[model samples]
Target: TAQTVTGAVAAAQLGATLPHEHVIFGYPGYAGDVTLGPFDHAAALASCTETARALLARGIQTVVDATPNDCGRNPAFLREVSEATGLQILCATGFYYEGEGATTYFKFRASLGDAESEIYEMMRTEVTEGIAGTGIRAGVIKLASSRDAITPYEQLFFRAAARVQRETGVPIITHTQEGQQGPQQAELLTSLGADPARIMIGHMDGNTDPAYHRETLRHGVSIAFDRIGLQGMVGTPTDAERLSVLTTLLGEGYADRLLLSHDSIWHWLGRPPAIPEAALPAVKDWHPLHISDDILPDLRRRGITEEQVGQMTVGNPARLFG
Candidate 1:
């Protein structure tokens, strides 16, 4: 049978969807970090439930959870919210950002097969059978690289991601930390025969340069201004700063290929000791509409209309996902 590209579906068609977010994941320090707290699943669920309700209130029908394969991508957990709240939840499949832990895993996986073969198999399995047999299909592929440079492991994952794009025709969403190395990543993916239009370079808002974003868009790849909230840790640009970059891009005629998201996960398993409690507060009290509230409203205050907001949040994502 020929491979089919499936549009993500939940309770409703995913319109005005934030194409990147995280529902659940366990990183290096995630387990130990939650030891001090009550660690109640019920509380977590309630918090997530409330968050979903807020999103629904805002008319967000779909949310693509970019929590990748290695991370704790709980399809069942997501399904619980989807069934209860009538929100469409899309899952991701691929590797995480390169680091010591990730590199260790990739080295082990390499013993099983060549890089290309491994990537092909992983992508094939995720597309053929839902990720690790959870029964929920992965609507997209998530790939990441470090800020310093693309490591050997990342290169392997990139090739694999490219293969997945070729095999399944599902789009690729990437984690580009601080917006550096985007051009290199884009060049590599395109060289591996992936379509630029099928990729979204994430976390561009972490950096202040519109020129870098424009360069990436020039290659026909989508740019995600994720990290809409959490300004300090993630280097959240001011409303004017963000609007300046966006408006310049819009003026350059690339609005149709942009994506916006808050890379905010309700739960952080292991926050640093020095970080204040308020910095890592309960999920419910966290800033609800980070960039949407500040930057977008500021745009409106500056005479930008709702139609432009629609173009950025609604029209662009629809076209990119389509």
Candidate 2:
């Protein structure tokens, strides 16, 4: 069963899941910003509910909230959204990548020794028990690495996540900076005793090379073009580039090893990004509905069968988080 924010959901009930998304997100230091004003829960709820409704209109059944514990993850807020809409939301139990994540606390813990064990217990408790006294259990263990390498700090997370995954049946998801280190992440996780089939590499869309996609798939792990519809961001590839590479992988019979989503955040924790009006056109499709609205149709036009699309949207996600 997939542990949703509200409760447990059977694997078969998770239909057309966008396995990576953020209902509410913040960079590490958002809480320290005193001048940015406070979070508006009611306004955020209204706005995010509309986004959830848009996804529901497009046949999306479940969404994996990939916001990590240190990245402004809120279990109660996710529960509220899942309750507001019928969308099955799965929360995560881990931290973000090292660079943008809050690492000082853990680094201090590491300096005192036993940080690995502490991290392991934190994730294991969230998975088996509950998160911070809330009775909500996380369905997945989210881990991340640096751009070119998994740093010593990040390796701690990878190790702890692998151990927890091996001991528990919950799935593991990852963040690969700029789409680099897909194979490396897979090798490290599986080497640490994580089952390859239970791991999904995030942000493979940041790299458009079919070679990178194939290399990651060679590990018997699923890869996500989860950053779909964010062409305007620096270091992010366009949907066109992502589509070409995805078509090649599908043609090569790797559809079963792929997942799809837009890593779009509905509510920002601090001040929202101020993109220039002239550059706004570049990110016009950066919403959650872009895949169902545009990408899927284009794939069908390219001769990708409904079965293949279904595998990416439904079957693969169910199997990954089941």
Candidate 3:
């Protein structure tokens, strides 16, 4: 059974999932100010529930809140949101990549000389037990890699996550930086004993190159064109560019190995997030609904059948959780 904020849910019941997104994220390293930030549960709850309702109106059923431990992951917050909206919200546990400048828990944890065992215990306990005494168990394992290399500390966390997966049968998900090193992530995770078919490498669509995506999928892991609506981010592909590659992949028979999400943070800690005014025009509608609203229509017009779209959004995510 897949764990959810409210209770355990059968994987097959998670129909038409977004597969990845952030209902509430404080961003890494802002724990201090995040503590002071307004809960504003009223506003945040309204926006999130509205989005989930819009998704349900069009047949979407589930959403995975893949917020890392280092980032501000609030199960209680999500529990409230999920309960109010009646959406199947699955939350994650585990660490993010903190290798380069070394800001996350990995930095200091690595200094303890027992990083691997420590990370394993944390993930194991959270999955088996609960996160931060909330009695809310994590639904997925979320680990990350940098744009360049997988740092030593990050490597230890991966091995630990693999160990936890080996024992618990939990699915592993990843954050791939700059759309690079996807092949490396697949090799390392599988080499460490996690099944490739159970791992979903995210941000693969950040690059518009089908070769990069094809190479990653070759390792038996699924790819998330997850950062779908974030066209304003530097070097990230535009929605049109991403859809082109996605269509090509579907034609090439990769529909089962793909997923979709907006990765939008509905509630950023401290204050309402302000996008760059220059790029605001391009990202005005950067929400999960756009996938169903605009992208699906475009895909249908481009020759992808509704069955294929269902496979990408529903069957693919169900298989991932199982």
Candidate 4:
């Protein structure tokens, strides 16, 4: 059984889980202040409900909200959306990339207590107790890293997440900038005694290089080619290239260690149009259903089997948090 924000749920009940996704996010501003919602709550809720409801019809049952605490994780709103749409939403608890978050929350928080101990206490408390008195506990531990290298500030979070994950048996998921530090991230976390079996290296699809994917997977952790539908022409990997990498990895017998998801954000906390117009046409398919609707069919046509698809969408997810 896996613990969800609402309650305990059997692994079999998690029908086609999207392992990496976001329901809400607020970009952190100066010092530690979050840029409050320029977003309309009612409109956003309606959009999320409609989107999730459609996905449910397409066989999606659970979605992991990977937004960190400093990014304005609103569990109350998530709870409302989940209940209204009957989607089993799993929220995350941990830190984001060091400088990407507010200094007041990250640097200031690290200043409050013994850095590792404080992070451990915070994450453990959320898992055991609840977040901010809402009684909505987190289902996964989310960690992130600096692009090209792991910064000292980010290292502390990895150590702390490893500690709590070791104690609580919660799965740890991570964000990799430009997919540069997957092997380094995996090595560091596992070196800190984090179990490779329960960790997921995310945003791996951002890179089309099979070598990086192979090196990271060599460490024995799962990899999520989660950015399934974001196909920005520049600075982002092309869909065709991502497909090549995904199919090649599948052929290499890494199905058991692969997870699929579209890191789709239903509601943006900062701006309505999270993506620019130029990227819209290419990324129009960047929704939860893109996997089931487009990618799966494409993979099948390209010689992937239903079993492999199930492993990525269902079995791998179950094992990730089971």
Candidate 5:
């Protein structure tokens, strides 16, 4: 069974899944500033419920909440959203990339020579048992790498996550900084005995080079153009650029190896960003609805058949989770 927050369901039952997104997420250490950033359960629930309802209207049936352990992954909050909106959601086990993740503790443990085993046990417990006493098992293993390379610190996580995935048969999803290290990520995880078919190299949209994407897919692992809408980051492509890349890849018959999502955050775990009006235009389409509301129609007009679209949207996700 593919575990959702509420319970496990057949992989095929996750109709039209968005394989990467966050219902509620905070950056590392957002929990430290309680005076300024205390979690507001009531307010967050109302907002996330509304976001989930909007996604349902746009035909999303399931979402993979990609927040990891050090990144404020709250399984209880994910369960609340799932129960309230009737949207199946999957929680993840692992940590974010080394640079952006909360790394001091893990690094310290590594110095003491037990970090690798501890990391492995953490993931095993979450997948086989539950996360932080929530009794909500993680359905996916989330890992990330730095921009240019997977550091030694990050390598330990890759090893641990791969081990859990091997034992649990849970799928692995990953973060690729600036669209780099995808093929390398695939190689590392598969080399560690994780099934290539059960791994996805995420944030490929961070790099628009079609050749880079094709190379990653050559490893027999899926790739995510998961950061669909948001742009204007240092290396993120415009939606137009992303469309061109998708068109090219789809034309090459790689839809089966692709997944798509907005990487949308429905609610921030702490105080939300305060983007100025001048900077607002870059992120106007950053919301989750942008895909069903705009991208699909655009694809159709570009001669993308409904079947191919379904392969990317529905079939591929089921196969990934299966």
Candidate 6:
């Protein structure tokens, strides 16, 4: 398979792209005894291969893995999966939420001034050298903020990300706390001269307010309802419920600024069991989104036309990531 231009490929090119999925993510303080539930690299790769084949059967082509920096990102793992399954894999860069090890790395040890150099070096390596030496360039830059306020670490990460955009022109994909701080993050990014069009405010689905979504869209920033099926993390809205919000917005002419994804990392290992008898599974086991069979059909049943679904799954991501 030939390497494609970063963000230049359409969502149609992605077929049924899951824009916010993860292949591997391990935080600094993550415990070894945690109930990883079979979330291993081999299992994740195999599951993604199977998922890609299933999506290919449905004409879906790409899967963007939004695993951010300091969050156990492995582009080599994704490259191996892409090779095995013929699925297009797009990876991300930038910082994670401020907590645990990430805080120490970005805030305490590395000053904000140093952070710019570190981020630039990482982005250059990921974009030019390829992740983990697999020759797979990162397709996007991931940024995030905590719930209460923009922490100093997050502020530094954003500035570093802004510098990357200024230097490399790569688009930025941000993780907002549901929807509360999305506008603030957008304001910060734009104030630093980052293109609003290139910024994707991920996790908007966790927020139920249509007005919030519309506000983010109005700022020329892309909105992503990335957490589709995980009813527990954020209250799960049914496909109809989600589409209702999307359709209303589209009808109001915000379709081009909207994107959708599952935010599903099929093999995520949850925290370890507190009890001695608690059986913690490895990190390689399967989960609901191992394939697109259920979610895509569910979206279709919810009165989302194929074309509209195409726009969310394919068109919008292409433009934003591009």
Clashes of each: 0, 0, 0, 0, 0, 17
Q: Rate the local accuracy (lDDT) of all candidates.
A: 0.70, 0.92, 0.84, 0.85, 0.89, 0.67
| Candidate 3 worst ten-residue window by lDDT | 98-107
Per residue, candidate 1 scores C-alpha lDDT tens digits across 1-322 of: 1111233443224567777887655675455556663345676688787888888887877777888766667767777777777767777778787763345666777877686577778777876687666666777788898888988878888888888788777778888866687878888899889988778888887677887887777777888877665545544565446667777776666667767787767654444235566655322212435555566777677666677777778776665555
What tens digits encode model 4's per-residue C-alpha lDDT throughout 153-244?
A: 88878888888888888899999988689999899988888889889999999888899999999999999989888887456677788999
> So what's the TM-score on candidate 4?
0.94
Give the clashing residue pairs of candidate 2, or none: none
Model 1 TM-score, 2 decimals: 0.86
lDDT of 3 by residue, 1-322 (tens): 7888888888788888988889888665565665567667788888878877777788887889998877778898888878887888889987777652235555676676787898899899988999898899998999888988988867887899899989998888888888798999998998888987779999888888899999988889999989888885777878989999999999999988988888877777775566677988567657878888888889999999989998988888888885
For residues 1-322, write the lDDT of model 2, one tens digit per residue.
9999989999999999999999999988888874774689999999999999989999999999999999899999999998999999999999888888999999999999989999999999999999989999999999998897999999999999999999997899999998799999998888888998889999998898889888888889999999888894788988889999999999999999999999899999987778898878667898899999899999999999999999999999999998
Better model by TM-score, 4 or 6?
4
Q: What would the per-residue lDDT of candidate 6 be over residues 44-70, giving only the tens digit for each residue? A: 677767866765676657777777766
Ranked by lDDT from best down, the candidates are 2, 5, 4, 3, 1, 6
Candidate 3 vs. true structure, TM-score: 0.95
Cα-based RMSD of candidate 6: 4.8
Q: Which 10-residue span in candidate 4 carries the lowest summed lDDT?
A: 29-38
Model 1, 275: alpha-carbon shift in Å? 3.7
* TM-score on alpha carbons, each prediction: 0.86, 0.98, 0.95, 0.94, 0.98, 0.81
Q: lDDT tens string, model 5, 169-280?
A: 8899999998799989988888889998889899998888899999998889999989888887667889999999999999999989989999988888767878888768
Candidate 3 vs 5: which has more TM-score: 5
